[PDB]
Structure formats: structure tokens, C-alpha cells
């Protein structure tokens, strides 16, 4: 028992192996999972004190999300004496200047931040690959496709291989998607994308030593009946919503930008109409899924959502449309509650009324869910219980949270044992039901759960991975698990022993779900046995396979200055450039992408374009470019679009729009370039 955490024998063995050869670290959940990474970082801390120009290396800790990046940053600050910096996009990193960017690199010996920020940082030559010592990739499973991890590690092919730092593939799970079929080739691709093989536990006492931190919670299946009959009011609200949908498609708000599919093949409704359609469709989903009382809570949430959208709307047509949506939301609520209350005359005790409607205005799913609550936490210690509720959609979080609050106040036994809480990821929703325009409870939901303030955490796949949480006592998987890694991390959330991990499934759908469960268990066993028996002392990929894993995509363009224009970031760079062009709030407009018809494609590019797609881009009128760049013919729409963006960015760089670091030139850069031509005479007075 020491304030300084002691490196373990297996941890030191793994650190020594990673020092000898880079690779992927596959470990179960625990504080040691990050402790091994901290030890590896401390191992290569020799050159931190030396300046960057003298070859003084630095440490880079690249992360998937901002929250877990913050957790790792504070962990490495608390466990090490080295200077560590935190860098996320929301901090205003980009407006920084080369000088103070370099001197903060000097100041902070370790850098922690999200993947995109560091990708932009390395592409802009703020740090060289030789300037880094270790590059840690936690949540190694996120190396799928064009994720920033994969493109970042593709970027290693440019610099000399001798200068490349040590990569660390920290992960708690290896399979990312439903790629159970031939796990071996998927992990081979993963360990070619990464420049080292996977290392994990193989010996029995090694597994026990890992169990000194990790655990092996059990899982229990809870099943409920289902029936297809629905109430008359369900159909009444359905018909009213459909009539409102018709009146909204015929609303004819002002002119809006054209929205098209991801492949630009078909049109879409304007974002203003699509938003409200999404709201009402999700409300109908919640209604049919979790009961009519849950529908009342969801409609209450829709009240505040429409209230805030109406308050912040500006166009009179949009104002009126929001007002109509809110009015119909009130009418729907009124029909629902009037149906509830006419039946709510058999008994008048509001506790008994609330319990009765929760028992009988709700689907069997919610009934069995709350029955599991009451039989699990009837009169137990509120400190003892600490459970997570995992749901599909964001609004399901609020619906369940409100329903559980009203049931806690509707249960004298559970009255003081359970403290529910919800939070959802991006596209965040006003966390209230009362339009409370000001609140002072500045403590976030995650902090409340961490400190034990909330003993229940309801979330939609936001607490499942990356976030730092205690060993949860129980986990409720309300909706069926879609993906292998989702199941693995969800079962890992119940990190305490003898935990309760519940799979809520329909009685009529037992077979498919249980076969999925055996499929996931088989995948896990295959991963384990593959990591046991399949091993080679090479431990690192060869040059030919390294280039083969990345030769497929379009070659990036690199300048003699050292910057690299990543083809997958061409669209982001171009759209950033188009953001900065307008000097008026009403003047902003995105580029007009276009797909050439087959006759047009042929008459433009000969017969050589047959069987391949072409995407044209027309720059906004205010921009200097007006040449209608044509993409190279490629196999698919996405490749052609990426090629068009890459070519347009190259042209913009050639015509001086980009500062050779591939960012759009600021006003300061232009005036500095003109200073010598027009303001040179200021020099004699010691000014510029």
C-alpha cells in the first residue's frame, strides 16, 4: 500500500516487451490497463528535458474522445512528474502560432489529446515524427477504415523508418464490428495497420495476476412477453401525426439549401423539416416501445424541445411552424392524458394511480424492467447498489429517467434507495422537462456517478467505453446488443464480482438472441486461442505488407516544407476554407457538388470513363476559383468525391490560397506578404 503505484511483474514484462518491440496491448478493464501505458511512457522519458531542436523527443498520447483524453491526461499528471499538456479542438488550439506552439511543445514534455487534433498538428509540421518518442493509441479497436488513427499511422510511411517512434496498441477489445467470421484475418489486418503484433495473457498465474485488477462478472437473461395489439389512442395520435406530416411537407418555408443523399443520388427534405420529422418519428418509436405513460413523458420532453427551438428560431415561417408543432404536441398530450385520467377514476391515491398506470399503461418490457428493479433494490443499501441502464436512443434516456423518478416517488420501498441520472453524447438535448432557463447544479452526471451521488446511470452507448467509472455493481442492457464489441464492453462495465448483468429479450425472440450470445462467446474464445497458439517472433510487419495495407488509397501530396495533404482530410480542409471566405452572416454557402450523367461523362472524358464515376465541384462565386474542377474517374462515388476535394485543394494551394501548410491563409499572412512591397519604409523607424 503506497501512494506511488508499484509496477507489477507482468506489467514490467509487458513494458520490457514493448521497449524491445512495439505492438498491440490487449488487457481487460482496470487501472493497470492505463498503468502499463504510463510505465511505458516513463520508460522513454530520458530525452524530455532536452530541447526539440537538439533532438529532444516527446511523448504523444492520442485518444478517441475528449473525456477519456482528459482522464488519461490527469492520470499521467498525477502518476508522473513530467510536464504534460492537454489539447482538444474546443480549447482553441488552431488559432495558435508557430512560435508559441513550438515553445509549448518545449514546455510540455508529454502531449495528450484527441486523434484529429494531433493528426492536424503532425500534418502541419508543428512536430516531426522524429521529434516524438512513443505514440500511444488507446482504444486500439477504433482503427477502422478512414478513422484518424489509421490515416495517422499511414502517415508514418513518409518519414524515414529509423526515426519512427514506438507505437503502443492499448485496447480492451480487439474485434470492433460484427466481423466474427474469420477473426484471424481481421486481427492480421489490424496488426499490419499497427506496426506490431498483439500481446496478452497466456499463463494461468498471469491471468490470476490480471484478475488482481480485472474481474469476470456473470450474466443473467431476463425475458418478457410481447403482443402485437395496440390501443385506439395509438392509432389516433398516429393519424394526427400523419396529417401534420402532410401539412408540414406542404408548409413551404423559405428557400433552403438542397440536401441530398450521401451518394448524391436522391434529394432530401430541408434540415428544418427533417428535424421535426425525426422528433415525431422518435416519439412514435418511444410510444410503441415503452408504453403510453412513457409516451406522456416523451411528449413532455417534446414540449420543451419545441419551446426552445421556437424561442431560438428567427424566420417567421419557422416560428409559425414550430408554434404549430407545439400546439399539436399539446393536443396529442391532451388526448393521451384524458384517456389516462378517465380510466384513472377507479382509484384516487396519486401514489396508487401512478403505480397502476406504470403497471398497466406500459408495455411488458417496462413492467419486467421495473419488476427487476423492485426485486433487486427493494430495501437494500443505497450505497451498495450502483447500476447502469443501457438503451438505444438518446431520448430513451430521458424517457426512462423521468419514468424511473416517477416510479421511485410511486414506490415507498424504493423511495430513498435509488438516485437516477441520465446523460447522452453529442447532439445533446436539454436535460430537463421544465424549460428551466437557469440552473446552478454545475456537477456533471459523470462526476455525480463517480462520487456516488447518483447510484443509477441511464445512458445510450456513451458510458459503454472510454469513460472512467468505478466497478459498477450491476448493468441492465435494456435493448438487445447489436455488435460484438458493444457486448464485450457492456459486460465489462459490471466490473465487480458476482455482479448482475441483465439481457432484456422478448420471449418470442429467444432463439436468435441466444444464438447471437453463443456467436459472441465463440468469437471471444477464438480470439483467446488465436492469441495463445498463433505467435511469431518477427512481431512486426514487413515493408511490403506495410505498404500493401495502405497503397490502395490515393497518394497524398507532400510539399518540400514537409506538410502533407491527406486525401481523406481534403473535404474537411476545403469546407474549412469555404467557411472563412464570406464576410457576411448571410453570405455563407457550401460548395455545389455534382455528379455528371453518363452521357455528360462520356462526352467529357471519352470512353475511358465508362464504368467509373465523376464528381464535379463548383466553388462559391465569391471565391477566386471558378473553373469547375472535375474529379478523376473512380470506381465509386466516395472515391471520386475525395479525389475532387484533393484536386481542388491542390489547385487552391498552387494559387496561393493555402499557406503551404494547407490551412487557408489568414488576413495577417496576406498583409505580411504585402508589407515588404508596400510598407517597407516603416523599417527605418523600427516598425512594421
Amino acid at each position: 500500500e503506497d501512494v506511488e503505484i508499484k509496477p507489477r511483474g507482468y506489467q514490467l514484462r509487458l513494458v520490457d516487451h514493448l521497449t524491445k518491440s512495439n505492438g498491440i496491448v490487449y488487457l481487460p478493464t482496470g487501472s493497470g490497463k492505463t498503468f502499463v501505458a504510463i510505465l511505458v511512457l516513463k520508460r522513454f522519458s530520458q530525452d524530455f528535458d532536452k530541447p526539440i531542436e537538439s533532438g529532444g523527443k516527446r511523448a504523444l498520447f492520442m485518444c478517441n474522445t475528449v473525456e477519456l483524453a482528459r482522464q488519461q491526461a490527469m492520470a499521467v499528471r498525477r502518476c508522473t512528474n513530467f510536464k504534460v499538456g492537454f489539447y482538444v479542438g474546443e480549447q482553441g488550439v488552431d488559432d495558435w502560432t508557430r512560435g508559441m506552439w513550438s515553445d509549448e511543445i518545449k514546455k510540455n514534455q508529454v502531449l495528450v489529446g484527441t486523434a484529429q487534433v494531433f493528426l492536424d498538428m503532425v500534418t502541419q509540421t508543428y512536430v516531426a515524427l522524429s521529434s516524438l518518442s512513443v505514440v500511444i493509441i488507446d482504444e486500439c479497436h477504433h482503427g477502422t477504415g478512414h478513422h484518424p488513427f489509421r490515416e495517422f499511422m499511414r502517415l508514418f510511411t513518409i518519414a524515414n523508418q529509423t526515426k519512427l517512434p514506438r507505437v503502443v496498441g492499448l485496447t480492451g477489445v480487439l474485434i470492433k464490428g460484427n466481423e466474427i467470421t474469420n477473426v484471424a484475418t481481421k486481427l492480421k489486418e489490424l496488426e499490419i495497420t499497427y506496426r506490431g503484433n498483439i500481446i496478452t495473457v497466456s499463463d494461468t498465474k498471469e491471468m490470476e495476476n490480471v484478475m488482481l485488477y480485472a474481474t469476470k462478472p456473470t450474466e443473467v437473461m431476463v425475458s418478457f412477453p410481447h403482443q402485437e395489439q395496440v390501443l385506439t389512442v395509438t392509432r389516433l395520435i398516429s393519424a394526427e401525426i400523419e396529417k401534420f406530416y402532410v401539412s408540414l411537407d406542404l408548409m413551404n418555408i423559405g428557400v433552403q439549401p438542397i440536401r441530398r443523399s450521401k451518394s448524391l443520388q436522391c434529394l432530401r427534405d430541408p434540415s428544418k423539416k427533417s428535424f421535426v420529422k425525426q422528433l415525431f418519428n422518435d416519439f412514435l418509436y418511444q410510444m410503441k416501445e415503452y408504453g403510453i405513460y412513457a409516451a406522456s413523458i416523451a411528449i413532455i420532453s417534446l414540449i420543451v424541445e419545441f419551446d426552445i427551438k421556437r424561442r431560438q428560431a428567427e424566420t417567421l415561417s419557422v416560428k409559425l411552424m414550430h408554434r404549430t408543432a407545439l400546439t399539436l404536441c399539446e393536443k396529442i398530450r391532451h388526448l393521451l392524458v384524458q384517456k389516462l385520467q378517465d380510466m384513472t377514476y377507479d382509484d384516487d391515491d396519486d401514489n396508487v394511480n401512478t403505480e397502476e398506470v406504470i403497471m398497466n399503461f406500459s408495455t411488458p418490457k417496462v413492467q419486467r424492467f421495473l419488476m427487476s428493479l423492485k426485486v433487486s433494490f427493494a430495501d437494500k443499501d443505497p450505497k451498495d447498489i450502483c447500476c447502469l441502464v443501457f438503451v438505444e436512443r438518446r431520448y430513451t434516456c430521458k424517457c426512462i429517467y423521468g419514468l424511473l423518478l416517477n416510479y421511485i416517488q410511486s414506490t415507498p420501498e424504493l423511495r430513498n434507495v435509488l438516485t437516477p441520472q441520465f446523460m447522452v453524447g453529442r447532439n445533446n438535448i436539454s436535460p430537463d422537462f421544465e424549460s428551466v432557463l437557469e440552473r446552478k447544479w454545475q456537477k456533471s452526471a459523470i462526476q455525480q456517478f463517480r462520487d456516488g451521488n447518483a447510484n443509477l446511470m441511464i445512458c445510450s452507448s456513451v458510458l459503454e467505453e472510454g469513460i472512467d467509472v468505478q466497478a459498477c455493481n450491476h448493468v441492465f442492457i435494456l435493448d438487445p446488443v447489436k455488435t460484438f464489441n458493444m457486448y464485450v464492453q457492456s459486460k465489462g462495465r459490471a466490473r465487480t464480482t458476482e455482479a448482475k448483468f441483465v439481457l432484456f429479450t422478448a420471449d418470442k425472440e429467444r432463439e436468435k438472441t441466444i444464438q447471437q450470445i453463443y456467436q459472441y462467446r465463440k468469437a471471444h474464445n477464438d480470439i483467446a486461442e488465436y492469441l495463445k497458439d498463433r505467435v511469431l517472433e518477427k512481431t512486426e510487419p514487413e515493408l511490403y505488407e506495410i505498404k500493401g495495407h495502405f497503397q490502395d488509397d490515393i497518394d497524398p501530396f507532400t510539399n518540400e516544407n514537409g506538410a502533407v495533404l491527406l486525401p481523406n482530410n481534403a473535404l474537411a480542409i476545403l469546407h474549412r476554407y469555404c467557411q472563412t471566405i464570406p464576410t457576411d452572416a448571410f453570405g455563407f454557402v457550401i460548395p455545389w457538388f455534382h455528379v455528371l450523367q453518363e452521357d455528360e461523362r462520356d462526352r467529357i472524358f471519352g470512353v475511358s470513363a465508362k464504368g467509373k464515376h465523376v464528381i464535379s465541384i463548383n466553388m462559391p462565386v465569391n471565391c477566386m476559383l471558378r473553373d469547375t474542377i472535375y474529379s478523376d474517374p473512380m470506381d465509386n462515388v466516395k472515391t471520386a468525391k475525395i479525389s475532387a476535394a484533393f484536386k481542388a485543394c491542390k489547385v487552391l494551394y498552387s494559387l496561393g490560397e493555402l499557406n503551404e501548410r494547407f490551412v487557408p491563409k489568414t488576413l495577417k499572412e496576406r498583409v505580411a506578404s504585402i508589407a515588404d512591397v508596400h510598407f517597407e519604409h516603416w523599417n527605418k523607424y523600427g516598425d512594421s
Binding site: 456473470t218 431476463v222 418478457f224 406500459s362
Partner: peptide, 16 residues
């Protein structure tokens, strides 16, 4: 119909 059909009061947690 007019009501949600009730369920048993004594379901169990099944090892799976």
C-alpha cells in the same frame, strides 16, 4: 383491449 395485458409477479433471473 383498452388495457395493457398484465404479466406474472414471479419471474426469475436465469443463468445464461
Amino acid at each position: 383491449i383498452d388495457r395493457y395485458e398484465q404479466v406474472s409477479k414471479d419471474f426469475e433471473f436465469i443463468k445464461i
